[PDB]
Amino acid sequence: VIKLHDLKPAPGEKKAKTRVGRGEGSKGKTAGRGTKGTKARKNVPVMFE
RNA sequence: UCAAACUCCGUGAUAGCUGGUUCUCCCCGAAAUGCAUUUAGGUGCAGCGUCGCAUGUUUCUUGCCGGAGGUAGAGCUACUGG
Length: 49
Hints:
Helix content is 0%, strand content 0%. The protein has no helix or strand. It binds one RNA strand through loops.
């Protein structure tokens, strides 16, 4: 019989959150931003070239 | 404390700048170029990476073939000049 502990999300339904800045074995020490620039502390507008 | 005091608030001011950004392993893996920029230590796009999808050897290497060049070299009584 189907109880609450039998319920599971479907495969691929749930992907783990990527946690940046949590070590160099992951997206660590820059969070995929690279080193410097405007793009290292802010985001650049799309309306700007 | 003074080329405009101090305090609170606006306010977590803004900083193309500096610094920092914390556990793991597996696979792949750059760039530091071009163009433009009140631009030149920034940024957009392209190039280069990855992932996915589609296509599938088209890529690449070698041989052969067809081709255009004007460098090296050479030449100048073949031009311009010396």
